[PDB]
Write a protein that binds this DNA or RNA. Sequence first.
DNA 1: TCCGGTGCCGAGGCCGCTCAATTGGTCGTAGACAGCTCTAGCACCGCTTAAACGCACGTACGCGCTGTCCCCCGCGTTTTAACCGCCAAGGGGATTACTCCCTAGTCTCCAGGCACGTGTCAGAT
DNA 2: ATCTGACACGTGCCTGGAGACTAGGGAGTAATCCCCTTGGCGGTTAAAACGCGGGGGACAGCGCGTACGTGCGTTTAAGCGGTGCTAGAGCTGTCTACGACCAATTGAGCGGCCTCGGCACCGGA
Lengths: 197, 197, 202, 202
Amino acid sequence: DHVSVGETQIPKASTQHLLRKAGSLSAAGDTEVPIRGFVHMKLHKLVQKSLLAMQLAKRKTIMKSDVKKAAELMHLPVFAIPTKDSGAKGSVFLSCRQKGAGSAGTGSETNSQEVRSQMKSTCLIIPKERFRTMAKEISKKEGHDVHIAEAALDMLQVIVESCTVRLLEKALVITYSGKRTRVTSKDIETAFMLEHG
Amino acid sequence: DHVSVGETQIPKASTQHLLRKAGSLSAAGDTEVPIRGFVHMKLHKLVQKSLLAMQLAKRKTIMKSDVKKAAELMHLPVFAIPTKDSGAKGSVFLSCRQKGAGSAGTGSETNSQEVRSQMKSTCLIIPKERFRTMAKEISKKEGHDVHIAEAALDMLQVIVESCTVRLLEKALVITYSGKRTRVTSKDIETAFMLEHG
Amino acid sequence: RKRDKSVNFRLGLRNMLAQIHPDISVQTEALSELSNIAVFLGKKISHGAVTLLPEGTKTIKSSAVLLAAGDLYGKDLGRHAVGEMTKAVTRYGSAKESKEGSRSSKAKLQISVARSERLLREHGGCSRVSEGAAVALAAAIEYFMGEVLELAGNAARDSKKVRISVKHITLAIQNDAALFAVVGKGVFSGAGVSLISVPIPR
Amino acid sequence: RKRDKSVNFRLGLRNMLAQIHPDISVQTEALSELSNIAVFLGKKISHGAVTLLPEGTKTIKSSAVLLAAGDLYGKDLGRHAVGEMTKAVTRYGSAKESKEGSRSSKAKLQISVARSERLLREHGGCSRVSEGAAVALAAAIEYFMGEVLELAGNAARDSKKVRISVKHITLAIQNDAALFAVVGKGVFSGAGVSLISVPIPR
DNA sequence: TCCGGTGCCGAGGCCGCTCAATTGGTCGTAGACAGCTCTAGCACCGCTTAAACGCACGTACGCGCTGTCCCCCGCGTTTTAACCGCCAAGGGGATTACTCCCTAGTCTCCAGGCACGTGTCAGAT
DNA sequence: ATCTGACACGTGCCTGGAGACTAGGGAGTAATCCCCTTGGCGGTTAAAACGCGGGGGACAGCGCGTACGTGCGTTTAAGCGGTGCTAGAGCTGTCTACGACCAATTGAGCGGCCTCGGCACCGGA
């Protein structure tokens, strides 16, 4: 359990999008609340580190270097684009999941199209300003309510999304060790338990 | 798979001793070759680091500080006794597993005695000089054949044993997530896969 | 024959120990145990505060260490600890205005008042270090050691042992999630397990 | 407006790129990708060789970096790399005896000849650094970048893309276990998966 | 099975050495605060539309049950060296002592890297 | 077959980098003493090595139980522009506060040795 649940959480469709991005073939209907919780959790840790950093800096706004040093304090090797980073739109479309061309729904993996199409996407998958709303809201609830730079915000996007993808990958490993196809929430908490515990 | 298997490996009874020390209730008959392999693997990594360290030191023998800095290069927080460390004999006996006093074999866990008795042992479980033979043999096969200090050797004992116990603990977590009692080798490789992969 | 080289721990650890638990004593091996745990905590927090936080070559600040402890320590434990940190700041302010000062270390309960300058400055993340930061470290390590040591002494009394044993420290750390998450990552005597709970099929 | 501050990568990365693959070009974003991967590798190996290995305040030695790379790099890859390291040692010996020397960087294929002194000395593990160690770093990072970049360019040709894309780097790293184990620990664009194999019930 | 008598080596206590920790002092230096410029973050509007959420259908997926077989674990016995202790020996670890090689510090020269602007084809439809 | 825009290429500017020279210490090498490793003998013993009974552990076929995957429609807002405000991001200035560095002082810590009692073993009730 131990799932921090705030009052603003990125849509569930985005969550299963992340899941299939990590290669989740199928997820239980409860898999989504916990992943929202722990993406919130990673976000919260990162923003706390960065924000206390800038507070030390006698600073009033987060910039790229801020979350940079914060993340490598989290012990993650990190870097992102200052000029023109990958955004959201940019992506393989949802309704083009059908394939008239090379029909999906065959086996090995069955879907065979959605996962490939979404993984081959450079773009960030979480809508930018919903995430920005989380950032501002958490900087409210603890953060002393300071300004955010979209560059730092988006590098935060990439950090958190890739980290949670790594989490889900470990979870899929867990599931296959459990010799079953669909991923459960319990699988995700077990993954996080191994991750730190 | 990917199990390095040398030509000198500490007895299997010691392996299952480690297993039950970590709290393994029961292990498949194949669980023991892989754990030997990966204890060898951790040993090999550690000794390589330490030995290249002393080779930098223009040194001819490993001492405590050597494996100390090597291990914290491995990113493990490490320390052990220079005066009088826990040895081997020292331990709760194997034949006193019976309990005339407080009979074992009841349930919750069933054995209820062997695991407790062995976990409550301060002493190192692997025979010292078999391990010393591994150290010398590996310093042959790669190490340029230099002298060893028993103090550094024994702190190496504690490092490797505790690390592999952590491994087995993660493996037990895996097994229970797999909803089954006995641990399999495959479980151990999955554990290591999560560990680094 | 030759005099010692490493970081001084023995007296300071047994110092303030009696006020934590007077009846209870220590094992020398457990004493070295706690010693290296302390110096590890110093290394980690010093590395965080120094190597990570200040942009550029800026001085290491007492507030820097304060934040470092706050993050490194748990949510509640960190919050309580940092308040204690400021308390120590006030105490050392009283020390420095006092002419007596640190000659008797003015209630700096652990020898940490002496080991702090070491663990910061010769950690060599930079050269530029405020003494207030050193006091902050002294307080942080001292609170951490006080809490863990008190739990250990309580365990020893539970085991009815006059002098502490290393297994008591093990049980204390695995017992408290807050302390464990800080230092349980490390390795030490015996198996060093985490003792995963609920042995039930998932 | 203001001139740059960070570690120079662009030309040196596209330098020697044509000999690796002439037809193939780079993406600017992929160029920064490879840049920070390079400087990370420099940081890690510099930290190993310097902070870890030499007892006391002893000089950082070329052999120190040599061993650092050998361990950090894979078994076979490290063995091949260290031989190449000594080759670079000989090459820079020829450089230093030459009056021309490093003014044209004498076949120091990457700008690594310039970034090396930075990544070592201002890593600040110590102050005491041999230039030979810097050449060793230059060689190590340069071989690593050459191998990964060649694999990436081959992937781009497989994708029939004139300029490299970041996904090509991703695929290259996940493809080679040796490179991945060194640098796949890090994070980067997109999901950053490891793509665990054999999706079969265990 | 619980409590008290038996016994030891280990912990506590003591002595003494000297150097760690402290103190004041200065220096200069790092930095903290004040002030100016103008970018961009933020707010708001407002439009487009893609996505999110809600709704339906069905069947795919979790997994436990018998039921099978099927395997390590308890118990045992058999076997040899692990441990331990002592002795020999010398390898080498640390320590002192002697020599010189190495880079940093400074200055100077220089060029290849930095930005900024214009036209063209790389890549997606 | 075409269009958007990323980039290849041209112009202009200067700091990153390199080389000569030096200071000087940091480093490498060498000699010596004995401490501590390495090996060998001898002994016990206890664990390694191994098998049998069994009883439970694992799962194939199968259905139980369902709710999630797929698919479609609507509403919300996500994206993205557009405008404006200004907060504030960065750079430079002064003023000085503070923490290095030097030197002297003090007694706390700790090595080493001696004392002994907390603690393990076991017999009696």
